[PDB]
Symmetry: D2
Subunit: 331 residues, 4 copies
Amino acid sequence: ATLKDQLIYNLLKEEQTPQNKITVVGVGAVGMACAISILMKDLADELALVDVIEDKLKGEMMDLQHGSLFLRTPKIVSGKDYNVTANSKLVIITAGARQQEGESRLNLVQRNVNIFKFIIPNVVKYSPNCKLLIVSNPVDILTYVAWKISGFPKNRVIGSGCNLDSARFRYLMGERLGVHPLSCHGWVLGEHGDSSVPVWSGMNVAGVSLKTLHPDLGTDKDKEQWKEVHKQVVESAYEVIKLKGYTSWAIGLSVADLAESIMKNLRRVHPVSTMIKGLYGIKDDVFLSVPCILGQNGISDLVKVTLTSEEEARLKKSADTLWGIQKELQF
Amino acid sequence: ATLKDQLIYNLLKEEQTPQNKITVVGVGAVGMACAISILMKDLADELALVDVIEDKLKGEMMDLQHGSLFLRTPKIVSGKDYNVTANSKLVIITAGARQQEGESRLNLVQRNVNIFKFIIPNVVKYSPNCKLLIVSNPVDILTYVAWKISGFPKNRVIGSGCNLDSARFRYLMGERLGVHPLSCHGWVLGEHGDSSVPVWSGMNVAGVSLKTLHPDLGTDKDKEQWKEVHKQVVESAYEVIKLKGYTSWAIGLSVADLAESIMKNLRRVHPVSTMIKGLYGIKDDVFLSVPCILGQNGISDLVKVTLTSEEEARLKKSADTLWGIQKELQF
Amino acid sequence: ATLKDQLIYNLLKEEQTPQNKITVVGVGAVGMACAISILMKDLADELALVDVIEDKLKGEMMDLQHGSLFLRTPKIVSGKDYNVTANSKLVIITAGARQQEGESRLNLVQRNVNIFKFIIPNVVKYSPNCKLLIVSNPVDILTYVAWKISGFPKNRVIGSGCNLDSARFRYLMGERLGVHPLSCHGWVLGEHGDSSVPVWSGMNVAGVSLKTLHPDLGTDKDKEQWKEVHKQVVESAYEVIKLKGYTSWAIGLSVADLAESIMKNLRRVHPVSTMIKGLYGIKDDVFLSVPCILGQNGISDLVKVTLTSEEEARLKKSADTLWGIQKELQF
Amino acid sequence: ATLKDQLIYNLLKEEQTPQNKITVVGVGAVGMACAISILMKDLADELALVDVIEDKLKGEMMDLQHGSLFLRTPKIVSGKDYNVTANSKLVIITAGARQQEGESRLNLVQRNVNIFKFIIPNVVKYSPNCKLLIVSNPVDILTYVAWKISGFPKNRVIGSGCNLDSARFRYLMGERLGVHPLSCHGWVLGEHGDSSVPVWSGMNVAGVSLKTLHPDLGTDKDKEQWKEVHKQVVESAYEVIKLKGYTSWAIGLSVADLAESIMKNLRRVHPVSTMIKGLYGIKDDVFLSVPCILGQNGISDLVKVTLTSEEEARLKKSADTLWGIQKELQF
Ligand SMILES: NC(=O)C1=CN([C@@H]2O[C@H](COP(=O)(O)OP(=O)(O)OC[C@H]3O[C@@H](n4cnc5c(N)ncnc54)[C@H](O)[C@@H]3O)[C@@H](O)[C@H]2O)C=CC1
Ligand SMILES: NC(=O)C1=CN([C@@H]2O[C@H](COP(=O)(O)OP(=O)(O)OC[C@H]3O[C@@H](n4cnc5c(N)ncnc54)[C@H](O)[C@@H]3O)[C@@H](O)[C@H]2O)C=CC1
Ligand SMILES: NC(=O)C1=CN([C@@H]2O[C@H](COP(=O)(O)OP(=O)(O)OC[C@H]3O[C@@H](n4cnc5c(N)ncnc54)[C@H](O)[C@@H]3O)[C@@H](O)[C@H]2O)C=CC1
Ligand SMILES: NC(=O)C1=CN([C@@H]2O[C@H](COP(=O)(O)OP(=O)(O)OC[C@H]3O[C@@H](n4cnc5c(N)ncnc54)[C@H](O)[C@@H]3O)[C@@H](O)[C@H]2O)C=CC1
Ligand SMILES: O=C1C[C@@H](c2c(Cl)cccc2Cl)CC(O)=C1Sc1ccccc1Cl
Ligand SMILES: O=C1C[C@@H](c2c(Cl)cccc2Cl)CC(O)=C1Sc1ccccc1Cl
Ligand SMILES: O=C1C[C@@H](c2c(Cl)cccc2Cl)CC(O)=C1Sc1ccccc1Cl
């Protein structure tokens, strides 16, 4: 006899399991930018947020819920407990430890391993069949860590890797050429961040190879200094941090694009971090970015890119370094 | 010649004005949430940001630019100087000071007036024919201030007003009824914030009046205490602030919804703040929220909601209160 | 090795059961309009088309496939055999025979029943747990027929019903009032087509009831003859047929809106046809339109609209006529 | 006081012009496929339709209007008279005879040139600053014709050209490689018709050149016979026409893709019909497809593709064929 009862007749109460649920672990600037971008792209019928800071977590959940009128994602939930993440198709990890001043790489990585040791088994408990997308840095090593802890098959553990680096590269390329980034093609591969590799041979507009038109492209004898574009990719990341104190929007949008391919089974190709053992004379269990076909099974295939000697040596050097760190990790 | 000349043959030099340009003034959490939501809804062909904090502004601009690959807004600019905002169709003001410890309400209002005294003339100078959308608080007073300083006609000066209040109300309504907020209709009008008025007579699902079904709706004798739903709207605002320190996602989404109606000339009805002199016995130059028709020329029409005597007296009290503050203001 | 094997390294060979699949049965003007609208709203990860005309079916499939670059639906299939429809979440039936000159109600219906006797069991064989959305006319009877043949529970059998009727009504309302139809609320219920019932008490803008401002609303003595709006809804149908020979675009869009609620579990309220036995003194198994909550389990709840005495009698008269035809159908 | 006056208080009247008006000439299968695709991409604030068949025209207009609740384009108009098209930003021409089974698009010249002689002056009369987008066949020849008749600068006269052939090519490529067409890059240039040219040398995935991996690619000695893919592109329209009588959906999507770049000033690269005088030693005023940068001024730049000697020969042969036809036209 309540108002709801007067107004609404119920036919059935049954089931109700999310069909396209996504979880974001960690609700810092990066996690929440991933969340808003995913929400505005209608990728999920349920979004779950997890963090260890409970106040912050509740506030972010409520803020998103309050915009429900303007969205098409009918259920947004959160909690410190992983039961809220049950039955996720895709779980995106942005949680981790921030590197201290003077702190060694091994030490920082070890701190994040200890964090993943709590996070990953809980994610797996509640969504045994999800794809894991790792955003946390250092992304290539932490993708390895998530893979190691989860026990997932290689296809279901994806690192955001060089996706953002490549998007920045295409923005800068577009600016130089006066063309939309969508029509400017180019690939930054290997280790995410400072050591990434710009594959000059693949840079093209409408299938016209820039390297072929301009053989000095990428080299030190290039009067147009196209090498500076890749340098600006690296520099701009530290610049944004210096200017606003963190980065969020671009990473959020790039993560949503990966999630789109995965959730809708598109099988588009993105530069993301995957287990690269067997390529480029790499014989250790290390993850680096190559172009990968992404769909409902995660990474079902990868593209074998022909690299120059110098490009190959750079990936190989990254692989040697990552393994040097990984082999000393305590799981 | 240059690589660019080898690759591209130019037919046309003469660039043109952006035709659907939007500016956001103030790049705090609210401003940037407005920005990301506007970008992901493809409402503008050029977006400008303005603020007085130069480093923050550049970093926000760059972060958005870096996501350009995933967007359809070909130009993002920013600057302290308002020449970057030239020819904006719509200018959204989210700039404001935060009330300090020990600071009176009147003194806070005056500080925001002093900020508008600098912002408004600059906006008007570069976009004399734009629509102004005021979000800064107290929004009803600052919308009056923008109107007064700009010398714009009332149709082109629009306050966010009770747009967010109403969205929260409908989210809460939807939760109670188990229906999507899009299908739960209800209007919160009058003075934005603590003094807003839930118009019980208009609350409905499928044109079925909740108040006709449940006569006690919105009263103290309401067995179900639906009054609490409005109370929760106001409570939730302070709770989000207590939990995450500010609010962003919901207001940003709601502002973008307004921007969509205006930019696309939709003539949808939204609860926004408008000059209401001559209504409900109000005879002063004050702005309050009623349902307004939004389109290309801003507020072309407003819906005259039938209000109960009690409801009318509340708006009247708000009007008296607002005018009493405005008459003491120093322009 | 093949060029493919040289380019791409495979991690694993698929292949999941369809996750978000929609089938459209009948690729006439209505079926294809549904298909293009569903494709452009990104509602499905797989679309299947079925018809009995094999060249037409294949050509339509190919035409859509050729636009794959512009879409986000990676798999489009078709066939006379229902094996192509397997594991559909939602199956939309637009198949029917066009009514002949000088053919009774009972005989046109019987022709479509004979069609359904073949279609329905095939659909059920390959997607035993799908939701069925019936569009074929007369839609209220054929929804009952699909319900009886399929053996599905009532929540999983939905008729488009008065969805299109209400969309036309709101377009006409918006034209009169100079407001977007999204903001012009009004419900046409009961039997689809000639005998539908415009519910005057629910017609409102911003929660302001027109019936309360204008008591004569929808009566004979109404100086503004608002009854003519509903008359125009009915006349519109026949005029479009007269003018272009069939209708496609509006019905296509309205159906895709229903699919959106179902595929995305939105729980929005739509006017669709559902099993109405138990309401308004209706004691026969008939399907009439009321506002229903649509989500992942089809119709989970319906809204109990308060109807006047005359409104109720019109529904009952419809139920009687519908049952009178149904009790004579040979299954 | 009428009901509207009771319900709505007007602030100001006076009609405003649309900001983003699009006209479609011809409401045949192609015209209406363009219309629905453009409406569902929210590209226009006004859509105008023109045809010589007056009832069909009214019927198609009404059918779209009835779908308004589901669209974000507030005004749709139609008329035999070109006054309905005034102030259009973009005018799309789809009127005219279409090829029948086994008939060449080149067999349509006399018919369609005659029709253009009436259409083009009318369009230019009412929208002197519009971009013209030509779709009618044979599209390259009719783009030249529209150019000559209108007296527009060539940047503002665009033929839909090979955007669709390239889309078909990429669809077929993606099917062979198991990758989404978006990630498969390959260009088909020249005549939208039998003499189109597949640019093997530019085909790639993730910047990896398929020709470098597979030197025989596209030649007669290709063990995988990739030339058959281009052959399928050439035969595409014929097959679809033989099956369903005409093509519509793919071209509708292609046209909307072009219209999006134009209306939103994206500066994306598309192969469209334009004047290629000055490229590849061509001295004639011939129109055919090469990659162009598309934006608010139409075609602002051409991308200069480096063709192999064999590719260049085929393109010049295409140009020879088309110019032989164009040059005989009398105005
Ligand atoms: N792969 C890429 O291209 C990029 C990666 N990143 C990385 O993304 C990560 C996050 O970025 P920010 O949001 O700025 O950092 P943040 O520190 O502001 O946010 C991290 C959140 O994770 C939470 N967290 C910590 N331990 C947790 C646990 N055991 N369980 C659940 N949550 C926990 C924290 O409470 C915090 O809220 C960083 O590692 C950053 O370096 C950032 C930009 C680009
Ligand atoms: N109408 C509504 O429903 C809501 C309104 N608000 C209001 O939005 C306003 C801002 O929100 P927040 O982003 O949290 O504030 P914030 O303090 O974080 O950001 C404000 C920005 O305004 C800038 N600013 C100050 N003076 C300026 C000037 N003279 N020119 C240009 N920029 C200037 C500041 O530098 C700062 O970046 C506040 O007034 C707040 O109350 C917030 C939520 C809801
Ligand atoms: N509920 C509503 O508001 C509306 C309903 N409709 C109804 O939609 C239906 C279709 O309309 P149109 O597309 O214009 O008719 P149509 O005649 O052009 O298309 C019918 C298609 O169904 C096919 N079909 C016939 N038997 C079949 C079978 N046994 N299996 C599979 N396919 C079969 C036909 O081959 C044909 O392709 C009609 O019943 C029409 O009245 C139309 C408009 C609105
Ligand atoms: N560029 C491309 O890739 C494609 C081009 N086409 C071409 O598009 C054209 C149209 O095809 P459909 O729409 O299928 O033909 P349709 O026969 O379905 O419709 C054509 C319309 O043009 C109208 N029309 C004729 N003369 C007119 C005039 N003087 N003014 C205004 N309207 C006039 C007709 O009345 C008719 O409604 C054909 O030339 C066809 O070959 C078709 C598919 C693809
Ligand atoms: O853009 C950032 C912020 C960076 C960061 C953060 Cl979030 C916090 C403190 C310091 C840094 Cl460098 C973390 C990170 O990986 C990136 S992407 C990046 C970094 C270096 C070179 C190239 C690229 Cl594309
Ligand atoms: O939700 C917020 C944050 C609030 C705020 C801010 Cl931004 C900063 C400091 C304190 C406060 Cl309360 C400013 C504001 O107007 C709102 S909306 C609101 C506020 C009170 C009652 C009802 C509503 Cl719908
Ligand atoms: O708009 C049409 C075309 C109509 C039709 C067809 Cl598809 C073919 C031949 C004749 C007719 Cl009437 C089939 C139909 O149900 C509708 S909707 C409708 C019909 C009557 C009154 C009100 C409405 Cl909203």
